[PDB]
Amino acid sequence: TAKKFKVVTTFTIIQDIAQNIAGDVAVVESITKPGAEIHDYQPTPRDIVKAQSADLILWNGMNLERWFEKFFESIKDVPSAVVTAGITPLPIREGPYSGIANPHAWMSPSNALIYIENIRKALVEHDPAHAETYNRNAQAYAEKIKALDAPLRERLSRIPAEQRWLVTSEGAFSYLAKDYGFKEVYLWPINAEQQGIPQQVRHVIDIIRENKIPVVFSESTISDKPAKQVSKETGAQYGGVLYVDSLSGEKGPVPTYISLINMTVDTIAKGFGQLEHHHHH
Ligand SMILES: [Fe+3]
Numbered sequence: 348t349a350k351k352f353k354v355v356t357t358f359t360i361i362q363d364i365a366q367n368i369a370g371d372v373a374v375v376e377s378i379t380k381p382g383a384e385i386h387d388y389q390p391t392p393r394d395i396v397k398a399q400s401a402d403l404i405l406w407n408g409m410n411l412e413r414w415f416e417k418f419f420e421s422i423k424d425v426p427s428a429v430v431t432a433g434i435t436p437l438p439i440r441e442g443p444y445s446g447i448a449n450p451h452a453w454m455s456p457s458n459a460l461i462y463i464e465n466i467r468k469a470l471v472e473h474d475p476a477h478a479e480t481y482n483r484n485a486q487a488y489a490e491k492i493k494a495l496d497a498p499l500r501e502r503l504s505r506i507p508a509e510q511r512w513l514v515t516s517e518g519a520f521s522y523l524a525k526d527y528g529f530k531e532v533y534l535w536p537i538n539a540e541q542q543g544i545p546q547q548v549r550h551v552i553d554i555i556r557e558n559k560i561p562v563v564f565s566e567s568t569i570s571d572k573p574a575k576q577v578s579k580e581t582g583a584q585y586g587g588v589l590y591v592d593s594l595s596g597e598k599g600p601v602p603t604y605i606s607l608i609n610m611t612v613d614t615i616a617k618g619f620g621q622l623e624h625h626h627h628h
Pocket of ligand 1: 386451517519538592
């Protein structure tokens with residue numbers, strides 16, 4: 348058989364999901380590389396050539412990729428497909444992007460089942476010669492995602508309802524927090540060049556003090572300094588780096604979509620746990 352069906356995605360979470368559905372019969376490549384900021388990414392000549400060479404382009408939609416529309420004007424005769432059809436959007440409530448959908452829908456495992464379904468449909472339509480391989484790989488991979496729900500829930504189970512505050516830098520965890528009963532606090536609603544972050548840093552400092560929230564987090568594609576400022580001024584621990592916008596590289600700590608969900612939930616649970624330094628009181 349000749350060269351495989353080539354799929355190009357806008358960022359790495361879609362790439363890894365799509366690659367599991369594709370298995371060995373298609374090659375899935377990501378426009379943005381691990382670690383790169385994906386909201387205001389600036390496409391390069393490599394990105395255009397890679398997209399022009401694909402047989403299918405997958406993107407998130409929900410205004411995640413602010414660059415995609417201009418980028419896509421420069422690609423001729425490549426079909427695109429949004430992978431979030433059927434997602435129920437949560438709105439951004441503050442800032443210059445109030446009213447636009449919060450696009451980080453993949454942070455909910457049960458939304459991943461909708462991503463998988465939409466990717467599977469797109470692949471079967473545009474490469475029907477391998478339809479049965481996509482359908483079987485999509486089914487098998489949905490079962491892996493469904494098996495995550497019960498252990499993720501167990502991992503968070505000793506944080507009582509009123510202590511479940513998720514304090515992060517980007518408000519990128521709203522779909523995860525909704526599924527698992529967390530109240531979200533963020534330093535900015537969504538990545539962008541924007542006013543109001545120093546103000547919000549001080550608003551969040553007050554919320555942590557009033558509710559005795561023990562931990563705050565940052566994310567892997569943005570600067571950890573505002574979160575460290577919050578930790579310094581409140582006494583809350585800096586709980587480390589959460590992954591939402593990007594996987595790591597293939598040899599780093601978060602190589603797959605499932606690992607991103609597990610590491611993020613585990614890092615959250617470790618931030619609330621009492622297993623630090625201990626004395627005999
Ligand atoms: Fe984001």
